[PDB]
Design a binder for this molecule. Structure first.
Ligand SMILES: [Mg+2]
Ligand SMILES: [Mg+2]
Ligand SMILES: [Mg+2]
Ligand SMILES: [Mg+2]
Ligand SMILES: [Mg+2]
Ligand SMILES: [Mg+2]
Ligand SMILES: [Mg+2]
Ligand SMILES: [Mg+2]
Ligand SMILES: [Mg+2]
Ligand SMILES: [Mg+2]
Ligand SMILES: [Mg+2]
Ligand SMILES: [Mg+2]
Ligand SMILES: [Mg+2]
Ligand SMILES: [Mg+2]
Ligand SMILES: [Mg+2]
Ligand SMILES: [Mg+2]
Ligand SMILES: [Mg+2]
Ligand SMILES: [Mg+2]
Ligand SMILES: [Mg+2]
Ligand SMILES: [Mg+2]
Ligand SMILES: [Mg+2]
Ligand SMILES: [Mg+2]
Ligand SMILES: [Mg+2]
Ligand SMILES: [Mg+2]
Ligand SMILES: [Mg+2]
Ligand SMILES: [Mg+2]
Ligand SMILES: [Mg+2]
Ligand SMILES: [Mg+2]
Ligand SMILES: [Mg+2]
Ligand SMILES: [Mg+2]
Ligand SMILES: [Mg+2]
Ligand SMILES: [Mg+2]
Ligand SMILES: [Mg+2]
Ligand SMILES: [Mg+2]
Ligand SMILES: [Mg+2]
Ligand SMILES: [Mg+2]
Ligand SMILES: [Mg+2]
Ligand SMILES: [Mg+2]
Ligand SMILES: [Mg+2]
Ligand SMILES: [Mg+2]
Ligand SMILES: [Mg+2]
Lengths: 62, 93, 77, 46, 102
RNA sequence: UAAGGUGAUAUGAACCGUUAUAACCGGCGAUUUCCGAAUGGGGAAACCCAGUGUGUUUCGACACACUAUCAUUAACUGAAUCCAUAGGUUAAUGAGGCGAACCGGGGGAACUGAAACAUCUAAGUACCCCGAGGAAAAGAAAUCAACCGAGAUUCCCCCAGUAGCGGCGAGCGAACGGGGAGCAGCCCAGAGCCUGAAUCAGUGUGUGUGUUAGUGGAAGCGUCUGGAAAGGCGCGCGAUACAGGGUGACAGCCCCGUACACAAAAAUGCACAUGCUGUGAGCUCGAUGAGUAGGGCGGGACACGUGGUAUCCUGUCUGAAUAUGGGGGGACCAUCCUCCAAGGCUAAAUACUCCUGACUGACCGAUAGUGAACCAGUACCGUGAGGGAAAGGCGAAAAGAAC
RNA sequence: CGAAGGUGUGCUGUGAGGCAUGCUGGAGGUAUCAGAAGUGCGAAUGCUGACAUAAGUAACGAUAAAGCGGGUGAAAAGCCCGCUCGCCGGAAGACCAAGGGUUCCUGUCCAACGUUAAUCGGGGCAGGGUGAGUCGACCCCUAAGGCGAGGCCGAAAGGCGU
């Protein structure tokens, strides 16, 4: 990501971000009920949402 | 009132125990761990949108984290918000 | 505070020297009086916390000059 | 018999609290020495 | 600038297994190296009921100090020393003996 | 910069990465809840409650931004009272608070010393308060000297425990002059002529250089004892490197280093070069700091305790001369010498160490050395200000003892 | 092929001491001559730590009071169950506020803690448990009192107050 995300328009980033949070909620909901085997996914989604929001902030006020 | 980014961050995990069971099987109430900052309205909203079910009423309570001693030094578990979400008679999940 | 708006005369410390030369700390307060002065140029009366020396300064320099200094100090009147 | 310490949290905070120390210059001088000594709790807080 | 790397043929200079040759299994932060078939230990591994796991005297390669191994110059059949240089736009290693790249 | 990684106790899990978005290191950005100057109002810190303005495939409530005080400036507005001034509102810019020592100022003890004690000492110390900077303060003679002369200030060594001061007691204690570190001079008190000409600060660019990551970095083998070799023995080799550390016992040649040789995309310190906004150079003719100098009174400061006591500061009362003039030369007068007060600025030598890097010690080695080698300003004590510990070592390797 | 330290021995010096050596230990010590001192301990009701003594002595915290059968357990006067007995009953019962902060409940464990045993516990460990329009707080309102734009006053710090 980061280069692949830098491309996409603001309207697009915000859409992807909604899916990221929707995924984050489900993955929380998985491990929560004791069903998530792939622990490392929680970290991934979280660190990706960060990139999105860093890119959104660099696009909006620059 | 609400937003999608917030409704997603609000619900955190479901809470299991013999009371969270009898609550479910005898009164159609789902016991949940919600964000400490989550209002009763924000839980109704999130449980209706993210779980697609009809919420009757939400009752909330804040649980105090237990303190454990390790000799001279102590530790304190985090404080959390428990949410009793009753649902209208058409039970699902 | 016991301060002359004109000269800047303030209380000083010294000693009460007895006949047996014993010294006990004391203050030497200035001769302060609040006095209304006539500003022809401003068509108003200005009250100033001034020393008796201060008055003699206003009598020489001229009220208009002395107030000019007060503006230059930021010291409102 | 009745001992010297009779607790009242309203009183405790209204007397030794952070806000209390913060009010006076000498109370501000207290917080200073505690921070300088490296105190864990500067005042009895929540 | 790491003289000994993963899956290198080395040769022991110090300790019980001095002279033995081996392939570098794993390298650790500690400045130590687990080398295949060197410095082995007969561990009395305790049983774990959460696997229902039996206990057993297990033999495993225990880490030797990276200063106790030298790089093996297969061509000279001798222990050697690594030196760095820039062949092209990339840094390389070479045997201090034959001045030849690895 | 890399072949290994996802901080520690602390494994395990699930994974990431190996020739270049794994990780790690450095520059610059993004984010940065709540409390705290804390600043929308309140408050028992980490909470409670608003106003205005915006947003609502829901335009309820929630989300978001703004809203403290003071100072200067600006715009509008505006009384007693006609003008005016006060007041009122908004906006812009600045301040606030924290913090080692050094520094300048405002206040200012006592215990003690005098073998008692009051003058005197301690001491302008301790402490409280205010303000500021990489230093601060001081600073270009109304200064000394002595009829020869010197030439701002700060600082060092002498002069000298001398001259003096002193219930002439206890004590306090200079200067002149000499040897040094360092050296630097200027502006206003106003007008014209020439005009932006010397200096300096803010700032863009460039170079040189320094900081914030880094790169390369020589030369060993046999044998003996031994669990193990760096130790014994034998023979080689490097050294602008034999500083130091680690490695299974003591290593120049196993590792990290060390001498030496290099390095920055970016941020920045300091210099010059250069551009620019602002400041003003040179010359002629002037001008030359007044409630001031001096004095009475009460104090304070000078090594100098009122003394025969100059010099300085001023609480109080008073008060000149104006270069044919005035200050000083330790009561005072005369002569002579010297200087020009009542306006300001100024680098260096000097003081310091919360902090960053390098190196060092006839300093300590766990009752020592920091209170603290260790999760210590902790545990614990106390209403609180505050007080305040004990506590290091298996082994080369956990092979931490299967059965 | 065994350093320092530890502990025996022997020889030696007038002595402080010195030397050698057995055992322990397991990496360090340092002649000689110089140089420098945190340089020698029995006392200071010395400081710190350790361990004696009295002594297996005094006590075991209200004189309301116990007895038995059964149980669990390695073990039972104390725990559980049962039947008796006794004590409080304007309290020794029930409920609040202040204060405490998980002590509540379940499982499990017994080193230490409990003045004894402990299977039991307010003890260890783990898990669970506190649900409000109408009960309390927040909120509106004020009291004593506090703070207080401007303000008045005060060497500074500050004091007072619209
Ligand atoms: Mg509730
Ligand atoms: Mg970075
Ligand atoms: Mg606020
Ligand atoms: Mg406030
Ligand atoms: Mg309010
Ligand atoms: Mg009018
Ligand atoms: Mg400040
Ligand atoms: Mg005396
Ligand atoms: Mg500063
Ligand atoms: Mg200065
Ligand atoms: Mg002359
Ligand atoms: Mg002196
Ligand atoms: Mg001289
Ligand atoms: Mg010179
Ligand atoms: Mg090398
Ligand atoms: Mg050894
Ligand atoms: Mg003059
Ligand atoms: Mg006389
Ligand atoms: Mg004079
Ligand atoms: Mg002058
Ligand atoms: Mg340092
Ligand atoms: Mg210590
Ligand atoms: Mg020891
Ligand atoms: Mg020694
Ligand atoms: Mg010896
Ligand atoms: Mg000697
Ligand atoms: Mg002794
Ligand atoms: Mg004795
Ligand atoms: Mg007995
Ligand atoms: Mg007896
Ligand atoms: Mg007896
Ligand atoms: Mg008895
Ligand atoms: Mg009893
Ligand atoms: Mg027993
Ligand atoms: Mg507990
Ligand atoms: Mg219980
Ligand atoms: Mg017991
Ligand atoms: Mg318990
Ligand atoms: Mg309800
Ligand atoms: Mg005020
Ligand atoms: Mg007040």
């Amino acid at each position: 990501k980061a280069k692949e995300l830098r491309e996409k328009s603001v309207e697009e980033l915000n859409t992807e971000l909604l899916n990221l949070l929707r995924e984050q909620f489900n993955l929380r909901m998985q491990a929560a009920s004791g069903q998530l085997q792939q622990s490392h996914l929680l970290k991934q989604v979280r660190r990706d949402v960060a990139r999105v929001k860093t890119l959104l902030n660099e696009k909006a006020g620059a | 009132m609400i937003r999608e980014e917030r409704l997603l961050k609000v619900l955190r995990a479901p809470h299991v125990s013999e009371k969270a069971s009898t609550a479910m099987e005898k009164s159609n109430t789902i016991v949940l761990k919600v964000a400490k900052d989550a209002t009763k309205a924000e839980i109704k909203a999130a449980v209706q949108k993210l779980f697609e079910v009809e919420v009757e009423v939400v009752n909330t309570l804040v649980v105090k984290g237990k303190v454990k001693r390790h000799g001279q030094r102590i530790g304190r578990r985090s404080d959390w918000k428990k949410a009793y979400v009753t649902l209208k008679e058409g039970q699902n999940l | 505070s016991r301060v002359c708006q004109v000269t800047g005369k303030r209380p000083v410390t010294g000693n009460n020297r007895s006949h047996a030369l014993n010294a006990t700390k004391r203050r030497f307060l200035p001769n302060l009086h609040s006095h209304r002065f006539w500003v022809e140029s401003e068509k108003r009366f200005v009250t100033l916390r001034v020393s008796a020396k201060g008055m003699r300064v206003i009598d020489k320099k001229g009220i208009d000059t002395v107030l000019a200094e007060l503006r230059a100090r930021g010291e409102k009147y | 018999m009745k001992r010297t310490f009779q607790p009242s949290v309203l009183k405790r905070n209204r007397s030794h609290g952070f806000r209390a120390r913060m009010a006076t210059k000498n109370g501000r001088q207290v917080l200073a020495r505690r921070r300088a000594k490296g105190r864990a709790r500067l005042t009895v807080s929540k | 600038a790491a003289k000994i790397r993963r899956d290198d043929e080395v040769i022991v200079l110090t300790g019980k297994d001095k002279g033995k040759r081996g392939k570098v299994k794993n390298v650790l932060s500690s400045g130590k190296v687990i080398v295949e078939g060197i410095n082995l230990v007969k561990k009395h591994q305790k049983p774990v009921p959460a696997l229902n796991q039996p206990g057993g005297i297990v033999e495993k390669e225990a880490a030797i100090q990276v200063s106790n191994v030298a790089i093996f110059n297969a061509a000279t059949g001798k222990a050697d020393r690594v030196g760095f240089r820039f062949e092209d736009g990339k840094k390389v290693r070479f045997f201090k003996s034959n001045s030849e790249t690895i």
